[PDB]
Amino acid sequence: MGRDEAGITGTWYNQLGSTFIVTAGADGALTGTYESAVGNAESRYVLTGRYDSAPATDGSGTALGWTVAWKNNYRNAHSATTWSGQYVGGAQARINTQWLLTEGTTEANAWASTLVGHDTFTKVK
Amino acid sequence: MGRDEAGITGTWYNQLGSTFIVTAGADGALTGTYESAVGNAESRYVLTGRYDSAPATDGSGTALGWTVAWKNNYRNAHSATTWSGQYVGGAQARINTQWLLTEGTTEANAWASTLVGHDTFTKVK
Amino acid sequence: MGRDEAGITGTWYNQLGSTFIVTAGADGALTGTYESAVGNAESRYVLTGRYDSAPATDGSGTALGWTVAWKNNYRNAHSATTWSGQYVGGAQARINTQWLLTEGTTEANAWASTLVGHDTFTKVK
Amino acid sequence: MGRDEAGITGTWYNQLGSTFIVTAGADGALTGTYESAVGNAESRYVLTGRYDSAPATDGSGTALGWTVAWKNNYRNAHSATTWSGQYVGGAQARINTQWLLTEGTTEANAWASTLVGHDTFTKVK
């Protein structure tokens, strides 16, 4: 059982009103679904990622990351987002992330392929 | 069969001499192993990610991303990297990425939790 | 007179308790001083940057950016931070930024040269 | 006289064919003009920034950064780019950077305000 397997598993919400549904495996796996409240997206998309299943015991957060490719049965935005961040446990548990959103482009437009931003996920809202 | 399933599957190398071994699934899954030539890393680490299995047919690249958590049987760097980028097929196939490397930190040090960089992967070297 | 010259000029504070003192010029210049509450920093450092002196009139924010090199009479952290973001005017005025912090490194360590993060500045606190 | 004042001052070119014309001051200032070969840009734009005028003497690079707001007499792209990076001196001198490009947006679109990328500048091409 990963140190924060129970803390990470469940339904999370970010500041945009997106919904992150994840299961943390004992082995370090993250699996689930993502629903974006914004952008060229509708309904759920598959996500997969990894987390540190044996984090530091000095009060540090737990490093994790995941990917969504923005293709499902409804839409294809020809793009993928990766979130990189840390889980911080406790009464007001949080996942604090930064993300990179890449779209497929021509070589001439590849300089403009990637958005960067930050999302904070909580168990409420 | 994903449009670039065959193009993406295989062994890739970046400019640091790291080795990315990946299998692309028909469903959009990426699975495999990563070996970093640099940093607090030794041997292989599990990776998982996603790719656009039906990309644009206008000469755009194929969006993809993946995650490594830097824990294996040898070491634990209490960190995770996510790569976000695009696959560009052809004689000199490439995966062009940007990445985010987050370490677990205390809340006081969380401003300094995340490195950013860029890796280019080719099928040779 | 830049559209938001008066709105941007003044003393700003971020979520870390750092202090950003800036003058916006009619020509698009930003000049002032930065004092970091965290990291290898003490007292004030010179800053310079630019802003859009004729922003869109459709309720969009005002794009701006600035640089600090972390050398002053007290310390030299051999690093520079750049903030890129937008000014949003009104009762609860804000500057919403993302930043890149580069340290001088050897070529072997250059993959690890750059931190990324996000700061929100307000006129209170 | 800054350690790399003479090395940094001059005309630089990146991989897109953009032109960076800069003067490094003894005090740590960068001033000059930028001409982008791509995007919503024409002719020269003002730039300002900072560099470490007393870098480490252990073979590390020299940290620097600069800003362009994409307004000139010809066009206004309501955006600003900041480059953060390091200068590496020698026969094949380089400035290795990462950048953040923010556009002014509405609050509803602010998640999508910022591009990230990387530019390498050389004294030839």
Swiss-Prot record, chains A, B, C, D:
Its main location: secreted. A motif (Cell attachment site) lies at residues 50-52. It comes from the Bacteria. It is found in: Secreted. Keywords: Biotin, Secreted, Signal. GO terms for molecular function: biotin binding. Residues 5-125 form the Avidin-like domain. GO terms for cellular component: extracellular region. Biotin binds at Y34, Y45, W83, W99, W111. Transmembrane segments: none annotated. Homotetramer. Belongs to the avidin/streptavidin family. The biological function of streptavidin is not known. Forms a strong non-covalent specific complex with biotin (one molecule of biotin per subunit of streptavidin). This is Streptavidin. It comes from Streptomyces avidinii. The chain holds residues 38 to 158 of 183 of the full protein.
